[PDB]
């Protein structure tokens, strides 16, 4: 949630989605922690999703 809020404010101030290597410096967490957090936050697709 903190990551989504911070990336929301960064997108609002610089007009683009922030890279994890600047999202990690607006926060104070290591960049690989931001990478694993971004890898975690996804919800599973339903297998009944039509292609």
């Amino acid at each position: 949630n903190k990551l989504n809020r911070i990336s929301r404010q960064m997108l609002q101030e610089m007009g683009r989605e922030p890279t994890p290597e600047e999202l990690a410096e607006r926060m104070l967490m290591p960049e690989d922690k931001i990478r694993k957090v971004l890898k975690i936050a996804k919800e599973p697709i339903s297998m009944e999703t039509p292609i």
Partner: protein, 50 residues
């Protein structure tokens, strides 16, 4: 099952079962807490509809 792109892919049955178990454990909670009848009636209705 994990898709190769790191994301997962589930069946809708896991979502429906997970809803059932959430409402059921909450009903057991409310029955232990001696909640008012409005709340336990609403929870029984939600478990029935889940």
């Amino acid at each position: 099952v994990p898709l190769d792109g790191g994301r997962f892919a589930t069946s809708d049955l896991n979502d429906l079962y997970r809803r059932v178990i959430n409402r059921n454990n909450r009903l057991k909670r409310l029955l232990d807490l001696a909640a008012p009848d409005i709340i336990v009636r609403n929870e029984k209705r939600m478990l029935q509809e889940a």
